[PDB]
Symmetry: C2
Subunit: 226 residues, 2 copies
Amino acid sequence: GQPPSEAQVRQAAWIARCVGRGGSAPLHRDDVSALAETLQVKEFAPGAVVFHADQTADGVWIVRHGLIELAVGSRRRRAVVNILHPGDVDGDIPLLLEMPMVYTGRALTQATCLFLDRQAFERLLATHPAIARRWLSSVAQRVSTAQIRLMGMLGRPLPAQVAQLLLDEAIDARIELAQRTLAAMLGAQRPSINKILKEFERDRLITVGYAVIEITDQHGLRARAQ
Amino acid sequence: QPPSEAQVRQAAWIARCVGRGGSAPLHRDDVSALAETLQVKEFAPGAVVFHADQTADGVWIVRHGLIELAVGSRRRRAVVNILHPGDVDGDIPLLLEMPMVYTGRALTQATCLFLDRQAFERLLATHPAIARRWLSSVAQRVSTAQIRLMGMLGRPLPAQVAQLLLDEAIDARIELAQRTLAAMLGAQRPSINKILKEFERDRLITVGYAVIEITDQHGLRARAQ
Ligand SMILES: [Cl-]
């Protein structure tokens, strides 16, 4: 079929940069344990949908086991914008903003997610001050981190921006994003991005693979990021 | 000697996360109830309320007067925002354990209320409605800025300028230096100056000394695309 619009990809990608991670998790795993019988335990076969784009955020999802792919568009030509690992959290900030989810989460491997519905979420915050307080820290961290990344791109040459984006996205020196998605995140023309990546590759800074990019010279790439 | 473009840009976008009105974490009734908790600070014009690069050690609520937010040496200051009664600042850097990134100076006689770190934690620990409202407030304030930044991506500069003027306008008025407008867009003053003069020739805006008035909102929205 057809790929989603540049606008849809850009919006999904940057909003997906506010997901909760290890260092920014709103609940400790021990808090999660204590919520047993309140959290709903959901199992997912590979390929199964956890939540749908454009549907109201009606609770908080915690990844417990497996990997969850975040993507926008039709399955065949969807744009992957992120991957959630065990401990990661999504749904809470859009709930706080009374917004729908703007991408779809699907199990990439056999997965278990824990669901805190809206009512349970409100009750938790109304009754547990320490949990409310850590949630506030988490939200501040996650949204500010995204903002600061957008701010930092401004006023810099595009190759510096691409270099910086790769460095920021890399996990174990790997960026698992399509070139099209990188272009969308930077508001850049796709041929412009291709040429930069090709130059970085020629200069032995990166390797461009099958919708993944490998960093081969971190210090050299840091220099391009200025 | 002046602040750098990156300094101005950073301070300006951070200043766009100030809590105001519906987005403020404390409403007027909360502030009244916190009378014997909040420290009342009085200022004369030119007084420094808080300094760039200093540790955020509490939350500021403006009660009376106007507070100019700016970066750079005093003589070469770039103004990035004005706080008005009801505005709340300092809470996000406090939550992040980060420094203030701009200096607040009183423009007028001013009264600010200060909720120090210890009082802030005690409030959050004992007031569930204010704790829950703070959560939504931080999310809303920063996301609103995030959305403005996202919406600039890949757009032509004249549309960005038109959109920024529309977003900044209070009662059709924008009080920022052209160099600051340019820094917020990641651009240089001559580029912005050329665009504003063309907008002014088409009777969309009127341009003064660090002040722009919108005179044709429909026309300017058209340019914002
Ligand atoms: Cl491409």
